[PDB]
Amino acid sequence: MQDTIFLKGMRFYGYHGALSAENEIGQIFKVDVTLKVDLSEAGRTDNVIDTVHYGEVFEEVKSIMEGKAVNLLEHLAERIANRINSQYNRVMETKVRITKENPPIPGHYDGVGIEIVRENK
Amino acid sequence: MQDTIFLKGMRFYGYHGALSAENEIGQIFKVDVTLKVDLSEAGRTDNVIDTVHYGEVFEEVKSIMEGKAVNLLEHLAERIANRINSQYNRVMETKVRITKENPPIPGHYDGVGIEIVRENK
Amino acid sequence: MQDTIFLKGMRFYGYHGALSAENEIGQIFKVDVTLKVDLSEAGRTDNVIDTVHYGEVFEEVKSIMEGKAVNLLEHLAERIANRINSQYNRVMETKVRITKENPPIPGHYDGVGIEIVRENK
Amino acid sequence: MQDTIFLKGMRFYGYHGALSAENEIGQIFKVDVTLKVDLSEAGRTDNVIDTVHYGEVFEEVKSIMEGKAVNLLEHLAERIANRINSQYNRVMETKVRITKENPPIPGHYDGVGIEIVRENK
Amino acid sequence: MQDTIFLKGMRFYGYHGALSAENEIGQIFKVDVTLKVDLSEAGRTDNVIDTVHYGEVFEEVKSIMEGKAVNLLEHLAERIANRINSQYNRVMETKVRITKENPPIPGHYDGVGIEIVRENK
Amino acid sequence: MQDTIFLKGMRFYGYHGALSAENEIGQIFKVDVTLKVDLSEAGRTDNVIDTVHYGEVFEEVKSIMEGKAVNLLEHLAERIANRINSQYNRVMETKVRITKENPPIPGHYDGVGIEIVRENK
Amino acid sequence: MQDTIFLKGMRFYGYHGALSAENEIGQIFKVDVTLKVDLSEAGRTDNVIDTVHYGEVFEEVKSIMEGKAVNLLEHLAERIANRINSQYNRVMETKVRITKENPPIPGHYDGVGIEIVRENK
Amino acid sequence: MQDTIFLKGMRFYGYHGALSAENEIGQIFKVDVTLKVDLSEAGRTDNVIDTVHYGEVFEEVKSIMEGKAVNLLEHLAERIANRINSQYNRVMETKVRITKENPPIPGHYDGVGIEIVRENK
Ligand SMILES: CCOC(=O)c1cnc(N)nc1O
Ligand SMILES: CCOC(=O)c1cnc(N)nc1O
Ligand SMILES: CCOC(=O)c1cnc(N)nc1O
Ligand SMILES: CCOC(=O)c1cnc(N)nc1O
Ligand SMILES: CCOC(=O)c1cnc(N)nc1O
Ligand SMILES: CCOC(=O)c1cnc(N)nc1O
Ligand SMILES: CCOC(=O)c1cnc(N)nc1O
Ligand SMILES: CCOC(=O)c1cnc(N)nc1O
């Protein structure tokens, strides 16, 4: 099964970061979410009740990104991946990629980040 | 076999959407189509009759995207995937990705959408 | 083995095309080439003689793209893939993607094209 | 395991190159690094000590890119891949892609380069 | 007075062109329209009746761009500039820029075109 | 005097619009602000007290963009221009450009909008 | 009179440059040409004979850019500006901007260059 | 006289900023420099000695951007504008634009900054 629902380039301004000054000033976090969900039924029925609504998924990402400040991007992605899977049974697997295009790193780069893939148990 | 014919960034203005106001105002839908087709013969013969003409494929996508308003992107992709496979035997598999870069979701994101992969039976 | 040498976004102005007017006016063709080549030796020795020089590969693509006008993109890719493999033994496999970002198709799209993968026998 | 930490679009100005004039004038080198690292622990603990800090990884890439001039991009990638793996046990595999968007090649292209994948033994 | 209403990056697929083959195959035309209109009243009243509605202006551009095939971009811009001014008194001046990003010119360029500025008499 | 302080590409999600459905669903509004302010003193003294702090200016734009829903972009720009000038004496003139890159207009365009220039009396 | 005909983002690979190694290896030169030409007649008549054909202008730029190697960008622009004006009476003024997005300068920048404006005497 | 020499998109990582944490972590500063310089002589002679070499100008910007940390962007631009004019007589006027695409401002914007124009006395 290779069907997916996606949310790309989601951006939030938070204060997460392993550096004290990071959490003090904050920055923009770019988030990419890809869910593994069978869309044949919804494709045939045309009923949003037979799929996973993205608007709702965006709410879950937002609430986590713009919530309490944590240290690692790994923790935010793990909280997002765990939150989506717990709420949606149709999501067989969740993949979260978070990017800090402007971290406290003296250099020239397009961005840094992490990406995790979490199956729905 | 890893050969493919593709149509990327196709854009249509339609009125599909699970919200009444969506179908009232409409928006731009971005569509990506990738077909699994062996191109050795056409590669050797140079005869467009030995491959699948994209211009025609674009017609099938257009007619569906700019046709009656449905509810889900899943339904549009399913109608496109089913329509291409029914018409072309050389297409061993069809993959449709539809993106709503500007849905009724209060946030900042590059876009949301779905992607399905349908084999040709 | 997942090492590769690549040439991306190569652009040539040619007159290939299944339409008579296409070959009359011409257009820009964008080409992407990816070769499967083991780079450990060259990585250790630092000797360009232990790898496949891209400058030369670009010559082979250019000569084919800016050569006689054929009909299908499939034929150009097949001529490129066959030409690279015949000349380089270190290339275990060749992948050619050609894009016509502006074909004779009345619509809005980022481009259309094909992609082939040819192993080196 | 599909988790990864990444550094994209890193750019350095060096004098590497198989041509004498290349090393004389120099140019910009774009580098992409992707590490295979399990992030569950760090995802649960939120402790940067349970993951691989990118800032440090960027230091290793920088020191190599802006260090002595070598001949091949293959040598730089091999030195980077070998250096990251030797220092971090949590990195199960390292992938380095280096791009010369402006080499001594008379043509129009977005760039040329190589990419290697090195497992951590 | 430096207030303006604008429509940028409007794109239409037409068959205009000084070459017979151009009008046969067609291409995409990008259009930029900038109108000189005092927006204080509308800025104070908030009444769309005190300004020039862009949706309507887009209709006038569309009808002309996707209408009969002419020869010069100069003629299309002149027809657009003359049509907007005749219909709207609040438009003190009209500026039309049309771009053919892909004309029958064997070369590499971002595009070619013209731009005219027509006062409303 | 040609000195300026600027805020470019500011984006807010609001519900302004001359159409009932517009205000119901909302959309993203892109805002560009350019202030005419002499920066010699601040350039010599290095004292943020001798210039106009952008962070504060962004607050004024935000509060207006994400405030009550009005009808015209002209009204939002007029409220922004009037609000900045009233608060800052050093701003000799304010210029506001607002863009609706995705309005209720069935077509292909990069965006539509307005731009006003208001001197500080 | 504010009418203009333009050629943007023209790119040529040449060997011009004040450094010996520059002329040895070469690089891409980006050229922007803007001509001041009254387009009312051509706008009314629709006769390409009443305007300045860009295809021809592109030929003049190309022949100069891809011709003998000079030292300064100033010399190339001066040769282009002088060549266009000498050939076309309808061009009341010529403006040439040349950019070296990748010169022999150790740093990070989008590009460097010059721009000249030459009236037609 | 409308001739100019330019340096666009220059980027440096510094620690300037009115906030203590800003100077602690640092960020990327984008700089645009435009000099008013007559290029006819250099255009005729082709002698780099008859113009202002950009490589040198880039050195002056770099040394200032990557030098001691100041508070305001206004101070950096004023130091750059004053430094260029003092060293080059042919520069009749200097214009410096500095952008902080990622300041300590909780929002979504492409960037903020200032721009000054300083004549050479
Ligand atoms: C300096 C702040 O660093 C981080 O937040 C961080 C570093 N490395 C990794 N892997 N994750 C992080 O969140
Ligand atoms: C509010 C409209 O929503 C949709 O159209 C929609 C939502 N979720 C999914 N998965 N598909 C849709 O088409
Ligand atoms: C109208 C010209 O069409 C083509 O050249 C063409 C169409 N389809 C495919 N698959 N390849 C082509 O080259
Ligand atoms: C002319 C310089 O060429 C190179 O540096 C080079 C060429 N080919 C490959 N595969 N690697 C290189 O580094
Ligand atoms: C070959 C087609 O050319 C044109 O259409 C054309 C050329 N030059 C100018 N100035 N305008 C045109 O429309
Ligand atoms: C359909 C909504 O239209 C508008 O909001 C609108 C139209 N025209 C102008 N000039 N301004 C607007 O805000
Ligand atoms: C090192 C090569 O430099 C140049 O070619 C050059 C430098 N400065 C100016 N103003 N023009 C040039 O062409
Ligand atoms: C919070 C840091 O702010 C600044 O550095 C700053 C603010 N406003 C202006 N006009 N210039 C600055 O440098």
Query: What is the Å distance from ligand 7's center to H4 Cα?
Result: 13
Cα angle, residue C63 at apex, residues C62 and C64 outer, rounded to 5°:
90
- CA-to-CA distance for C43 and C50, rounded, in angstroms? 9
Distances (CA, A) of D46 to A67, D58, F80, G67, H15: 15, 21, 42, 61, 28
Burial class (CB in 10 A: 0-12, 13-18, 19+), A117: middle
The SS3 of residue G87 is helix
Q: Going by CA atoms, what residue is nearest to atom 11 of ligand 3?
A: C72
Residue with CA closest to ligand 7 atom 13: G72
Dist. CA H63–CA G107, nearest whole Å: 12
CA distance D14 to D62: 10
Q: Which residues line ligand 4 (CB under 6 A)?
A: C 5, 48, 51-55; D 17-19, 22, 72-74, 104, 114
Angstrom resolution of this structure = 2.7
Pairs of CB atoms within 8 A across A/H: 31
Give CB contacts under 8 A, 24+ apart, made by H21-24: H21/A21, H21/A24, H21/A25, H21/H104, H22/A25, H22/H103, H22/H104, H23/H69, H24/A21
Residue located nearest, by CA, to atom 3 of ligand 8: H18
Contact indicator for B27, B100 with CB cutoff of 8 Å: yes
Residue whose structure tokens are 């106009």? F52
Q: Which of C6, C54, C58 has the most ligand 4 atoms within 8 A of CB, as the residue to mutate?
A: C54
Q: What is residue C66's three-state secondary structure?
A: coil
Task: Check: CB of residue D35 under 8 Å from CB of residue D5.
Answer: yes
For A113, the closest chain D residue by CA position comes to D6
Q: How far apart are CA D114 and CA D98, in angstroms?
A: 6
D46 DSSP assignment:
-
Are there at least 3 beta-carbon pairs closer than 8 Å between C and H? no
Question: What spacing in Å lies between the alpha carbon of B73 and ligand 2's midpoint?
Answer: 7
Mutation test of the interface with chain G: which of E71, E74, E115, choosing the one with the most G Cβ atoms within 10 A? Answer: E74
- C22-53: b or e for each residue (b if 16 or more CB lie within 10 Å)? bbbbbbbbbbbbbbbbebeebbebbebebbbe
Of G11, G25, G108, the CB nearest to D21: G25
Contacting residues for F51 by C-beta, under 8 A, at least 6 apart = F5, F37, F39, F41, F42, F90, H72, H74
CA angle H3, H5, H8 (to 5 degrees): 130
Judge whether G73 is annotated as a binding position.
yes
Residue C98: name the closest of C12, C3, C37, C35 by CA: C12
> What contacts F87, CB < 8 A, 6 or more positions away?
F60
Asked if C101 reaches chain B (Cβ–Cβ under 8 Å), the answer is no
Cβ contact G48:G39 at 8 Å: no
Per-residue tokens: A105: 């790193």
Ligand of minimum distance to the alpha carbon of F37: 8
Q: Give just the sign of the alpha carbon dihedral A48, A50, A54, A58.
A: positive
Structure tokens at F29: 């509004």
Query: Which residues, including other chains, have CB under 8 Å from residue B121's CB and lie 6 or more apart?
Result: B85
The percent of chain D in helix, strand and coil, each rounded to the nearest 5, is 35, 30, 35
From chain A, the residues in CB contact with D53 under 8 A are 18
Question: Do residue C43 and residue D107 have CB atoms under 8 angstroms apart?
Answer: no
Q: How far apart are CA B90 and CA C75, in angstroms?
A: 17
Q: Is D73 annotated as a binding residue?
A: yes
Binding site listing of B for substrate: 22, 54, 73-74
Among candidate residues D65, D102, D66, the one with its CA nearest the CA of residue D80: D65
Residue B115 neighbours by CB under 8 Å, 6+ apart: A2, A3, A4, A6, B32, B77, B95, B96, B97, B98
From C33, C31, C40, select the one nearest C2 (Cα to Cα). C40
Q: What string of DSSP letters covers H80-120?
A: HHHHHHHH-SS--EEEEEEEESS-S-SS--SEEEEEEEEE-
Alpha helices in chain B (DSSP H): 20-25, 40-45, 54-65, 73-87
Backbone torsions φ then ψ of C51, nearest 5 degrees: -145, -175
Question: F–G contact (≥3 CB pairs within 8 Å)?
Answer: no
Enumerate neighbours of F (3 or more CB pairs within 8 A).
B, E, H
Q: Which CATH class is domain F1-121?
A: alpha beta
G40 vs D74: CA distance, rounded Å: 59
Experimental approach taken: X-ray
* Distance in Å, CA F97 to ligand 7 centroid: 37
Q: What gap in Å lies between CA G57 and CA G48, rounded to an integer?
A: 13
Q: How far apart are CA C46 and CA H1, in angstroms?
A: 52
Do A44 and B112 make contact, defined as CB atoms within 8 angstroms?
A: no
Contact G85, G91 (CB under 8 A): yes
* C78-105 per-residue burial string, b: 16 or more CB within 10 A, e: under 16: bbbbbbbbeebebbebbbbbbbbbbbbb
For residue G95, indicate whether it is catalytic: no
Characterize G74-106 residue by residue with b for buried, 16 or more Cβ atoms within 10 angstroms of its Cβ, and e for exposed.
Answer: bbbbbbbbbbbbeebebbebbbbbbbbbbbbbe
Tokens 């050939």 locate to G87
CB D110 within 8 A of CB D86: no
* Bridge partners of residue A113, in order along the sequence: A99, D6
> Which residue's alpha carbon is at the smallest distance from atom 7 of ligand 4?
C53
For strand D4-14 and strand H111-119, is the pairing parallel, antiparallel, or unpaired? unpaired
**Pairs from H16-20 (Cβ < 8 Å, separation ≥ 24):** H16/H69, H16/H70, H16/H71, H16/H72, H16/H73, H16/H75, H16/H76, H17/H69, H17/H71, H17/H103, H17/H104, H18/F48, H18/F53, H18/H71, H18/H72, H19/A25, H19/H104
- Closest partner residue to B39 (CB to CB) among C70, C104, C116 is C116
- Min Cα separation H47/chain G (Å): 7
* DSSP strand pairing (F111-119 vs E93-100): unpaired
d(CA B17, CA F21): 13
Query: Which of H95, H108, H112 is facing F54, going by the closest CB pair?
Result: H112
In sequence order, what DSSP letters do the residues of E17-84 get, joined into one string?
A: -SSHHHHHH-EEEEEEEEEE---HHHHHH--GGGS--HHHHHHHHHHHHTSS--S-HHHHHHHHHHHH
DSSP assigned state of F90: S
Angle at G34 between CA G32 and CA G37, to 5 degrees: 165
What separation in Å is there between the alpha carbon of C48 and the centre of ligand 3?
Answer: 38
Query: Has E60 been labeled as part of a binding site?
Result: no
Give the integer Cα–Cα distance in Å for G39 and G5. 9
